[PDB]
Amino acid sequence: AGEFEFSGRNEKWDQSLYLSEHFPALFSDVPLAGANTIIAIMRLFTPQ
Amino acid sequence: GFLRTDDLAIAANFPRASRNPQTYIPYTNQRGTVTNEFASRFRTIVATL
């Protein structure tokens, strides 16, 4: 339906998860309460 | 650390000087973790020091 179902697990990414339905969570661009400074740095990686 | 019972010695019927043979292993096995919960204890010590 289009929601972002986050997992809630601190797992290291490996590139075999690239073909799966998991995404990197730094690049969700979803505002988080209390952690706005991390998201404001991840806005700098957007393509121009 | 933690307090491990000597399950392998009592089943092998080794001599012990206690009622519950319990040695103190200094730090926990820490598999499968990204942040190491023994290393992050030393983070909060230096941040205090």
Resolution in A: 3.2
The Cα of B37 is separated from the nearest Cα of chain A by a number of Å equal to 13
User: What's the CA gap between B19 and B6, in Å, rounded?
Assistant: 11
Extract the tokens encoding A23.
């995404």
Q: Is A12 on the interface with B (CB under 8 A)?
A: yes
Give chain A positions within 8 Å (CB) of B33.
10
DSSP SS3 for B2: strand
For residue A10, give both structure tokens. Answer: 């601190």
The sign of the CA dihedral B45, B28, A17, A29 is: negative
Q: Nearest-CA distance from A8 to chain B in Å?
A: 13
Between the alpha carbon of residue A26 and those of residues A9, A11, A17, A46, the distances in Å are 13, 13, 15, 12
CA distance A4 to A20: 15
Residue with tokens 């983070």: B43
Neighbours of B49 (CB within 10 A): 5
